[model samples]
Target: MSLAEKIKVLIVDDQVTSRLLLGDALQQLGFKQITAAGDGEQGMKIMAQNPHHLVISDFNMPKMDGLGLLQAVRANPATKKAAFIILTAQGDRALVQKAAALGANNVLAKPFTIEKMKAAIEAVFGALK
Candidate 1:
């Protein structure tokens, strides 16, 4: 089995399509345990209940944005070490810089393909297979 087969991953996005897109990508990359949250608040709840190894979130959401979630993860004791990656639109250059400053491990540009997803995750934990 691939190394990614057992790692837990959390995806926080307001849109169901965004959630599913990342979910499908993770599954395709051989991940097993995956959870989806509507916003950063729910993501934190999930993390508190059972911390994940990585976070893939959207930059713009109703309850909480990616930068806010990144701050929470970096500051919280439980999720302080979790690898964080934020999804953002190409136009949001400043937000991307802010996200990096907030301690995001990486940022995936919006409308990304599965290949780009794989590349980003690989940067966090090396090759999947």
Candidate 2:
């Protein structure tokens, strides 16, 4: 399969609109395999079964937050190597630091454009080969 076809992306967010928008963006970006979860807990459950290539999650959620999900993914042997991105409206320095400390590959600010999202994905995937 091609790189885009091979890569499996999971988007975790509380808002249905956000999920739909992100999912549509991913599809438009040539990503063939995409999954979505309503919250971090659901994201983790999907991760446990599917082992996604990357995870893009919202910072705040009901069941478990993005940081908590990132930490869990890093702590788990099965999913430790999965690339993680924390997408949030809050661009606080402390939150960025925390996400970095928790092993997130990238942190994207909310209201991101398609170009920005592509750049973030490229930063993690490195030339998409």
Candidate 3:
């Protein structure tokens, strides 16, 4: 079997614990260069400074929410092509459909696991292999 490519992942959440948990999970999954941010604004700043292959952002935040961040990414040519994934507690069908329509690469409900992370990343970037 061929080895899959290493992916750089940015995890954005308002809660520190959530960021740590996700970052730890990504580390355990053998993904290098995992970055974390307190909110969408911080995430955007970090993304602008250092490009990432994928982004995982929380939906509700103070300055900019996940959807807003997605819009920013889509508007920027430098980071427009980056894989964007939304992590939110809101799982209503309407919200999910809206996210899809807005071009989110994937959506993971709150309280995810290592396995789910692996699956989500694979589903989005598998063709990159």
Candidate 4:
């Protein structure tokens, strides 16, 4: 009896494999309203029309990066409250600092476990299971 099925999730990753993995893990966790975008630009467009409860994006992508989307999300009135989680394949302290300063909810590395993803999302949404 939680928001697992009710809450909307947006996954923005230029890599098809990464996007599918994230999507499949979310589905396994019982999330119903999941949308995948190819890049930060597409993700922003989706947010403009359909604001989501959470945004999971890749750190590096074409057109716009995850930080750009995070910045725009925070700047936009409609998506300002949305929880943002960025995924990266490499470690960068500056990236974390920037994302935190921009009000990102969490950060994850690529090739993460479903449990880790759950922990990050649950930390924001609180045990969405």
Model 1, TM vs. native: 0.73
- What are the runs in model 2 whose C-alpha is more than 4 Å off? 1-6, 92-94, 109-111, 127-129
Instruction: Give per-residue lDDT, candidate 4, residue 83.
Output: 66
Off by over 4 Å in 3: 1-7, 59-62, 92-94, 105-111, 127-129
Q: Could you estimate the TM-score for every candidate?
A: 0.73, 0.74, 0.72, 0.74
**lDDT for model 3:** 0.62
The sequence of per-residue lDDT tens digits that candidate 3 reaches over residues 83-102 is 66666655564875687567
Clash totals, every prediction:
0, 0, 0, 0
Query: Between the candidate structures 1 and 3, which one is better when assessed by TM-score?
Result: 1
Q: Predictions ranked by lDDT, top down?
A: 4, 2, 1, 3
Worst 10 residues of 1 by lDDT: 1-10
List the global CA lDDT of all models.
0.63, 0.64, 0.62, 0.64
Model 1 alpha-carbon miss at residue 1, Å: 23
**What tens-digit string does per-residue lDDT give for candidate 2 at 20-106?**
677776667765466776577787778646756666666555365556666777767555555656666566758766786658544
